[PDB]
Amino acid sequence: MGAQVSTQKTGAHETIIHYTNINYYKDAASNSANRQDFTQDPGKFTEPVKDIMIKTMPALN
Amino acid sequence: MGAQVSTQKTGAHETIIHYTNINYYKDAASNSANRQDFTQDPGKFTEPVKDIMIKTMPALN
Amino acid sequence: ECRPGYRREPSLSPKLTCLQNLKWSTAVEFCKKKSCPNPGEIRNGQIDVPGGILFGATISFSCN
Amino acid sequence: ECRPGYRREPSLSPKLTCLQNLKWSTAVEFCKKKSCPNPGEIRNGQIDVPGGILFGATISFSCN
Amino acid sequence: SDRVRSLTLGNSTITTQESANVVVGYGRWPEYLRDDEATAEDQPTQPDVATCRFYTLESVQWEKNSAGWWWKFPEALKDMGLFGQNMLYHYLGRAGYTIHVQCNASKFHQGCLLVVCVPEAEMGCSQTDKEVAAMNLTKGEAAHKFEPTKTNGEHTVQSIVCNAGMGVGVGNLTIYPHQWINLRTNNCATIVMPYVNSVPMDNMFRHYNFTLMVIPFAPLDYAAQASEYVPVTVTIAPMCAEYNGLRLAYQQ
Amino acid sequence: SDRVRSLTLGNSTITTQESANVVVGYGRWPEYLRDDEATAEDQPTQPDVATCRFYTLESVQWEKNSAGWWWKFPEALKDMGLFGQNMLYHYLGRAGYTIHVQCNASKFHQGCLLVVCVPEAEMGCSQTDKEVAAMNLTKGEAAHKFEPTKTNGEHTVQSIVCNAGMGVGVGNLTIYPHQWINLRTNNCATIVMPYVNSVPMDNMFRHYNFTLMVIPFAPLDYAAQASEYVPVTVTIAPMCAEYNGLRLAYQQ
Amino acid sequence: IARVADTVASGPSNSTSIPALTAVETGHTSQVEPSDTMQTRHVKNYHSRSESTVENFLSRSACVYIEEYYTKDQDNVNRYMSWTINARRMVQLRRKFELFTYMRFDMEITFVITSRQLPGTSIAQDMPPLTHQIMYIPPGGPVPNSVTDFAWQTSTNPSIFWTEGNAPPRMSIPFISIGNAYSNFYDGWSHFSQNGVYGYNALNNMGKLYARHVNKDTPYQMSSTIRVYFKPKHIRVWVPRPPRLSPYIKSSNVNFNPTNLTDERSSITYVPDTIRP
Amino acid sequence: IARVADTVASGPSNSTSIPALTAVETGHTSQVEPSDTMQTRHVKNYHSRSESTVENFLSRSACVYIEEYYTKDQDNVNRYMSWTINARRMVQLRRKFELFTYMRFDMEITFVITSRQLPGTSIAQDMPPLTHQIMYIPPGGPVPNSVTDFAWQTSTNPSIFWTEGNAPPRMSIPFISIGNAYSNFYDGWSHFSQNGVYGYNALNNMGKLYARHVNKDTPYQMSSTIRVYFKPKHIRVWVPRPPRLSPYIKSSNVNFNPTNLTDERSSITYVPDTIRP
Ligand SMILES: CCCCCCCCCCCC(=O)O
Ligand SMILES: CCCCCCCCCCCC(=O)O
């Protein structure tokens, strides 16, 4: 089938950890949640300044 | 799929003995128990001595 | 001056200052509780120390 | 028990044992001299501290 | 001759001419915390020779009717040189420890002690309806002793030996790092305990990582005119001592 | 902008937005004792971050009639965290120190202090016929102050400023590691002192390696309604602290 | 993958570097870390922000509504359910959604229907399993006025038929909004003359949902309680905002009563002494 | 794979080899076998310690709790369940876990919920299937004070809705502990002043678990009994210890009564004669 093997979340016996998935429905809205999308970009809220500010330097000068 | 064939435990008709497995869930905590991990090292408790002791020899000399 | 029975803590001032806000400065533990002698031992018995052995502390006894 | 004015040293036993030689065990400094308050300061003056400020100590004064 | 052995940690050295090998914890030897297992971000302090040395505790007397004794660490070393000073000024601590119990007699005396290190030796109360007090669990370098009979104290520990004050069988304590001191063959016992805990580090006043128990299975005995005074001294030396969270000393 | 600077030692950090560079002892920077210069055979202890951190002493008030102040180290830090604990338990010591004197006012205040580090600042007595008492030389983190006039004390130090209590000219103290705190341009002063002594190491209670003196050459002044309270705080942090000769703590 | 930043080992310092000094006036949040203001040790941090994901945060079934409807036609009891779909009547889920201004996602809807028999002196029955019918009516569709209305024919409107005992009915729905994203906040009106409806209700219109018993009638009065659950998935959120501080009063607007910024305490220097040996 | 050691064939002996002689003082357990103290024959031992595995030993559902909650609001009967999760109230499973000091593992939790109708003279009913709701509340979450509390909205707290008749509800959970391993024994306190709580309760805090009937009300009083089962999997254990000898008294500490080391008997030389022709 259109099987798609992904990686499972670390277990309590770490340091065959993968699962299989197949969509049965025609609408993408039927698929399960995307609990594995780990994107980040705090810059939008933490550093929305026009002029890049270097940590080790004075904010104003 | 991400099928993984392993060996079954001996049956009452020994002396096709393998099973198939596929994880359906995204979390490793959902997987079945690891009833086939046979590791051993009694040394920790039976021989936690600093100086190796040879059976056929005197413990003290 | 330490009350009875308390003892001075060499690392701290037994003094207080009247701040601008008419509040006395925060007091430290310049005077601590005097510790009682080690209860000792009871032959074929036990000493229960629920809350240390300093002044005001209590200890119970029992026999095996 | 500490005399006046001495204070107990938490790290040591205020107890003595009668040894086999009929000698009392060597005594430690289980009771030390209580320290006096910091002499302070004299405006346009000086405080001479020849031997610390503990009990029994003396301090002299002078003016610039 | 494996009978003789020498131990050197810091400015301290122990000698023995009648030992019985050396038990090394659970097969592991004391080691500093690795970066892939650390949690405290601040750079730890490692006094080394300053705290990692042999500290001798108050000796104890072994009598024909002695039931046993026990110490709790690192608490028992709260007033020991700089090792105790770091416990006061730091929030977190981590150490190894090399337990060395001494006890000599003569070829004419007899008895057998059980030197054991029990991790998380949670103990019970005399009165099952009440709780225990820290004062009754551990009291500095002063050892608490087991009783051959039941105890009654309000907040005292059930010192009855047969249950080791844990509600278990004393004969099964051999499952912990241990050694025996069979006077007819021994003279001391050494145990190198590695840091054992469910956390990289922990407070040293609030938590008693392990308990050292010395329980005699063979009653001390001897004939007339034979030295009746048989003391049992305990010496312990921290190993790979690390400290984190420096702040104002804790008022005991 | 070289005006702003940041200092980080251990778990302490100092900030400045009006400094004047940094004086580094006699061109040297604190360093541990080398093997080809060591004498004590025992392996030294180096608490590092435990003792090498910024210790703030009791602040002092600068008044229109203030003549000066002075501290003696390492004595002045005998009760400072673990740095003081190592002084008690060890016979020998060795450290660097980073002196940082703070003192802010306003563009409307005026005055000029002289922060200096005087090695072996042996001082004289008020009564030239008598001797001085340690109690009058240094009293913990409590600062001794210079007087604008002659002193008379029995065993007191000749606090008269003009002679700096050493029988010399105050205007020549600039020959020692120093900096000024000219309120109209400054805000603090930092001096990195390297271990200076005629011996690899030395006792820290018996010997006062150096004396920190803060003498104002420009009297503090201001107009009405202008903050009259102008404190002067001193912060110092040991560097490359080494210790030898571990033994029972010294009873002060 | 979603790992956290490690802490670089830092040593002593003495330079013109001022990472600790800054100016919030710029609207810039300091990017300082422990290693910048002290001596730190290297630490391989394996922690992960995997559960902080907007997906894992909002993707959890939460109750959004609940109504009761009876079987027999006695008194003035409603024999069917009606509901103008929205998630503003349940403070819990409503508060989460309101952490963001706009949202976009598909959704999993689950229904927990339970029945009961009203108290009585003589109520001995033997009613077969109760079958329910949930019908979704998008804006404009004909609304039923009785438990026997022709509207229940479900000719084109999505509907579910469930019998008690079986697993709670469920079904997914895409992104319905006619806009490019659902709007949790609408600082505007419905009419150009700046009047009429103000806020959410001014533009949101997900239609209505009706329920009923398909069973003709029960000997003695019985009632059922339907609980609607929402579980957004394939989530997208924009413009974060200050969480709700004041309790929710109305489900149509953001009205509130002046609430305290937080709990009180003795003084700014008050800190409970928890160390008392 | 997990096979047992075979017995090498041994013959007569007469040397300075002393495998039988040793010294327990070293704390070393003799590694002697039959072939060392007698003449043995070769034996291909096929036995396996496969069931002695810590995994196979602890990985078996064991009851850890049980409470009863009623449907009607009559008298002072609790209509919902509350429970501060822990496995110290059931001696069986508690004793196994306590064979080790520290533990690390994921866990499979199963619930066995059963209901009944309290006795009565006239209790003729016809109640539909009873639906239950089990909600987990991690430390800090809002706790419900009634069977109609807003907390049951389960906005973010994990919750299960189960109807009688179906298979007992189940679900897995990872390794929650904030530490690197669960602690069965904690010889320490909760406060730095060495006081307050002592032992397990001093640090363990898995939160609470609540249950209830989602059904509005029952004509006549009925009650349900929920039984919680734990089945650790993907197990890891450290520091083994002496099994519990004294009976368990409290579920908060290790208090006990001086118990006998074992059963008694006539004398050290007593052995029952089982051969009597
Ligand atoms: C078939 C049932 C259809 C139900 C539609 C529900 C849509 C929910 C949209 C929520 C909008 C919002 O929260 O801002
Ligand atoms: C969703 C239900 C969560 C239940 C958490 C149970 C955690 C059990 C931990 C047991 C700890 C121990 O036995 O030492």
SS (H, E, C) chain H: CCECCCECCCCCCCCCCCCCCCCHHHCCCCCCCHHHCCCCCCECCCCECCCCCHHHHHCCCEEEEEEEEECCCCCCCCCEECCECCCCCCHHHHHHHCCEEEEEEEEEEEEEEEEEECCCCCCCCCCCCCEEEEEEECCCCCCCCCCCCHHHHCCCCCEEEEECCCCCCEEEECCCCCCCCEECCCCEEEECCCEEEECHHHCCCCCEEEEEECCCCCCCCEEEEEEEEEEEEEEEEEEECCCCCCCCCCCCCCCCCCCCCCCCCCCCCCCCCCCCC
Residue F93 · residue F243 · CB < 8 Å: yes
Q: In this complex, do E27 and B59 lie within 8 Å of one another by their Cβ atoms?
A: no
Going by the DSSP 8-state scheme, the letter that residue G182 receives in this structure is E
Nearest ligand 1 atom, CA G177? 9
Residue F126 · residue F115 · CB < 8 Å: no
B39 contacts in chain A (CB < 8 Å):
none
| G25: helix, strand or coil | helix
CB-based contacts of F136, cutoff 8 Å, min separation 6: D46, D47, D48, D49, D50, F144, F153, F155, F156, F157
Q: How far apart are CA E82 and CA F249, in angstroms?
A: 9
From the CA of H93, the nearest ligand is 2
Query: Cα E133 from chain centroid?
Result: 20
Q: How far apart are CA H95 and CA H91, in angstroms?
A: 6
Phi/psi region, residue F21 (left: phi>0; alpha: psi -120 to 50; beta: rest), is left
Q: In this complex, do F6 and G20 lie within 8 Å of one another by their Cβ atoms?
A: yes
Task: Evaluate the omega torsion of the peptide bond into residue C5 and state whether it is cis, within 30 degrees of 0.
Answer: yes
CA distance H117 to chain G (A): 14
Q: How far apart are CA H191 and CA F35, in angstroms?
A: 46
Q: In this structure, what token pair is assigned to residue G237?
A: 């959120």
Residue E147 · residue E157 · CB < 8 Å: no
Q: How far apart are CA A52 and CA A43, in angstroms?
A: 11
What is the enclosing helix (H) or strand (E) of B5? strand B4-7
Q: Which of residues 177-196 of E touch H (CB under 8 A)?
A: 177-182, 185-186, 189, 191, 196
E23-24/E188-192 β-pairing: parallel
Please give the distance, rounded to the nearest whole angstrom, from the Cα atom of residue F197 to the centre of ligand 1. Answer: 81
Q: How far apart are CA E197 and CA E119, in angstroms?
A: 8
Going by the DSSP 8-state scheme, the letter that residue B24 receives in this structure is -
**Chains sharing 3 or more CB pairs under 8 A with chain D:** C, F
Q: In this structure, what token pair is assigned to residue E194?
A: 């590695």
Q: How far apart are CA F82 and CA E86, in angstroms?
A: 8
Residue H173 lies in domain: 1-277
Q: In this complex, do D53 and F136 lie within 8 Å of one another by their Cβ atoms?
A: no
Going by the DSSP 8-state scheme, the letter that residue C9 receives in this structure is -
Give yes or no for residue G158 CB within 6 A of ligand 1: yes
Residue E89: CA count within 13 A, CB half-sphere = 23
F23-24/F188-192 β-pairing: parallel
| F82: helix, strand or coil | helix
How many CB atoms are closer than 10 A to CB E194?
A: 18
Give yes or no for residue G139 CB within 6 A of ligand 1: no
Q: How far apart are CA E30 and CA E194, in angstroms?
A: 4
Give yes or no for residue G147 CB within 6 A of ligand 1: no
Q: Is G5 on the interface with A (CB under 8 A)?
A: no
Q: In this structure, what token pair is assigned to residue G256?
A: 């509130």
Q: What is the resolution of this structure in A?
A: 7.2
Q: How far apart are CA G212 and CA G134, in angstroms?
A: 7
Q: In this structure, what token pair is assigned to residue H38?
A: 């007698």
Residue E195 · residue E95 · CB < 8 Å: yes
How many helices (DSSP H) and strands (DSSP E) are in chain D?
A: 0, 4
Query: Cα G275 from chain centroid?
Result: 42
Q: How far apart are CA G177 and CA G107, in angstroms?
A: 12
Q: At what angle do helices E81-89 and F81-89 cross, to 10 degrees?
A: 170
Q: How far apart are CA G114 and CA H163, in angstroms?
A: 9
Please give the distance, rounded to the nearest whole angstrom, from the Cα atom of residue H113 to the centre of ligand 2. Answer: 19
Compute the CA torsion angle G48, G53, G59, G63 (nearest 10 deg). Answer: 100
Q: How far apart are CA F9 and CA D32, in angstroms?
A: 36
Report which protein residue has its CA nearest ligand 2's atom 13.
Answer: H87
Please give the distance, rounded to the nearest whole angstrom, from the Cα atom of residue H232 to the centre of ligand 2. Answer: 9
Q: How far apart are CA H82 and CA G114, in angstroms?
A: 22
Residue E101 · residue E214 · CB < 8 Å: yes
Give yes or no for residue G58 CB within 6 A of ligand 1: no
Q: In this structure, what token pair is assigned to residue E107?
A: 């070829």
Provide the residue ranges of all domains of chain F, joining segments of one domain with +.
1-252
CA angle D51, D56, D62 (to 5 degrees): 55
Please give the distance, rounded to the nearest whole angstrom, from the Cα atom of residue H60 to the centre of ligand 2. Answer: 15
CA distance H36 to chain B (A): 9
G208-213/G80-81 β-pairing: antiparallel
Q: How far apart are CA G221 and CA G205, in angstroms?
A: 34
Size of interface C-E (CB pairs under 8 A): 80
What DSSP assignment string belongs to G230-272? EEEEEEEEEEE-PPP-SPP--SSS-------SS---S-TT---
Cα distances (Å, whole numbers) of residue C33 to D8, E252, F102: 12, 10, 38
Give the CATH number of domain E1-252: 2.60.120.20
Mutate to test the interface with H, among B6, B38, B47 (most CBs of H within 10 A): B38
Residue E51: CA count within 13 A, CB half-sphere = 30
Nearest ligand 1 atom, CA G200? 14
Q: How far apart are CA F187 and CA F183, in angstroms?
A: 6
Nearest-by-CA chain B residue for E1: B61
Q: In this complex, do E22 and B60 lie within 8 Å of one another by their Cβ atoms?
A: no
**Chains sharing 3 or more CB pairs under 8 A with chain F:** A, D, E, G
SS (H, E, C) chain E: CCCCEEEEECCEEEEECCCCCCEECCCCCCCCCCCCCCCCCECCECCHHHCCCCEECCCEEECCCCCCEEEEECHHHCCCHHHHHHHHHEEEEECCCEEEEECCCCCCCEEEEEEEEEECCCCCECCCCCCCCHHHHCECCECEECECCCCCCCCCECCEHHHCCCCCCHHHHHHCCEEEEECCCCCEEEEECCCCCCCCCECCCCECCEEEEEEEEEEEECCCCCCCCEEEEEEEECCCCEEEEECCCCCC
C46 contacts in chain E (CB < 8 Å):
126, 136, 147, 151-153, 156-157, 159
From the CA of H229, the nearest ligand is 2
Q: How far apart are CA E122 and CA E57, in angstroms?
A: 22
Nearest-by-CA chain C residue for D7: C7
Q: How far apart are CA F170 and CA F153, in angstroms?
A: 22
A29 vs G2, G19, G173: nearest CB: G173
Which residue in this structure is represented by tokens 């639906």? H131
* CATH architecture, domain defined by A1-61: Irregular (4.10)
The total number of residues shown for chain G amounts to 277
Q: Do chains A and H touch (3 or more CB pairs under 8 A)?
A: yes
Residue F199: CA count within 13 A, CB half-sphere = 12
Provide the residue ranges of all domains of chain A, joining segments of one domain with +.
1-61
CB-based contacts of F60, cutoff 8 Å, min separation 6: F69, F143, F145, F214, F231, F232, F233, F234
How many CB atoms are closer than 10 A to CB F10?
A: 24
As a 3-state breakdown, chain F gives helix, strand, coil percent values, each rounded to 5, of 10, 35, 55
What is the enclosing helix (H) or strand (E) of G103? strand G100-117
Q: Do chains A and G touch (3 or more CB pairs under 8 A)?
A: yes
Cα distances (Å, whole numbers) of residue B45 to E140, E173, E175, E192, F52: 30, 12, 7, 14, 43
Residue F13 · residue G33 · CB < 8 Å: no
Mutate to test the interface with D, among C1, C2, C6, C7 (most CBs of D within 10 A): C7
As a 3-state breakdown, chain D gives helix, strand, coil percent values, each rounded to 5, of 0, 30, 70
Q: Which of residues 1-40 of E touch H (CB under 8 A)?
A: 20-21, 23, 26
Q: How far apart are CA F210 and CA F121, in angstroms?
A: 6
Going by the DSSP 8-state scheme, the letter that residue G99 receives in this structure is T
How many CB atoms are closer than 10 A to CB E1?
A: 7
| G129: helix, strand or coil | coil
Q: Which of E84, G76, A58 is nearest to F6 (CA)?
A: A58
How many CB atoms are closer than 10 A to CB H10?
A: 16
Burial F168-195 (b: 16+ CB within 10 A, else e): eebeebeebbbbbbbbeebbbbbbbbbb
Q: How far apart are CA H127 and CA H132, in angstroms?
A: 14
Q: How far apart are CA E169 and CA H245, in angstroms?
A: 6
Q: In this complex, do F81 and E246 lie within 8 Å of one another by their Cβ atoms?
A: yes
Cα distances (Å, whole numbers) of residue H252 to G163, H184, H185: 46, 11, 11
Residue H153 · residue G95 · CB < 8 Å: no
**Position G246: which residue type?**
S
Ligand 2 binding site (Cβ under 6 Å of any ligand atom): H 85, 87, 97, 103, 109, 136, 158, 173, 176, 182, 184, 204, 206
**CATH (domain of G177):** 2.60.120.20
Nearest ligand 2 atom, CA H87? 13
Q: Which of G224, G221, G204 is nearest to G213 (CA)?
A: G224
Sign of CA dihedral F162, F163, F165, F171: positive
Nearest-by-CA chain F residue for E47: F47
> Domain count of chain H?
1
End-to-end alpha carbon distance in chain D? 44
Q: How far apart are CA F8 and CA F52, in angstroms?
A: 10
From the CA of H139, the nearest ligand is 2
Going by the DSSP 8-state scheme, the letter that residue F75 receives in this structure is G
Burial A45-56 (b: 16+ CB within 10 A, else e): eeeeeeeebeee
H106 contacts in chain A (CB < 8 Å):
11-13
Q: How far apart are CA E125 and CA E127, in angstroms?
A: 5
Phi/psi region, residue E245 (left: phi>0; alpha: psi -120 to 50; beta: rest), is left
Q: In this structure, what token pair is assigned to residue H235?
A: 């197990």
Q: In this structure, what token pair is assigned to residue B40?
A: 């051993």
Q: In chain B, what is the greatest distance between 2 CA atoms, to the nearest angstrom? A: 63
Q: In sequence order, what E strands does F17-109 have?
A: 23-24, 55-56, 60-62, 69-73, 90-94, 98-102
Give the method of determination: cryo-EM
Q: Is H13 on the interface with B (CB under 8 A)?
A: no
CB-based contacts of E212, cutoff 8 Å, min separation 6: E70, E71, E72, E73, E99, E101, E115, E116, E117, E118, E234, E236
Q: In this structure, what token pair is assigned to residue H275?
A: 């051969």
How many CB atoms are closer than 10 A to CB A2?
A: 6
CA distance F109 to chain D (A): 23
Nearest-by-CA chain D residue for C15: D37
Residue H162 · residue G245 · CB < 8 Å: no
Please give the distance, rounded to the nearest whole angstrom, from the Cα atom of residue G85 to the centre of ligand 1. Answer: 6
Q: What are phi and psi of E18, to 5 degrees?
A: -150, 65
Going by the DSSP 8-state scheme, the letter that residue F202 receives in this structure is B
Nearest-by-CA chain B residue for H50: B38
What is the enclosing helix (H) or strand (E) of F136? helix F134-137
Which segments of chain G does DSSP mark as H helices, in order? 54-58, 91-97
End-to-end alpha carbon distance in chain F? 46
Sign of CA dihedral H164, H165, H166, H172: positive
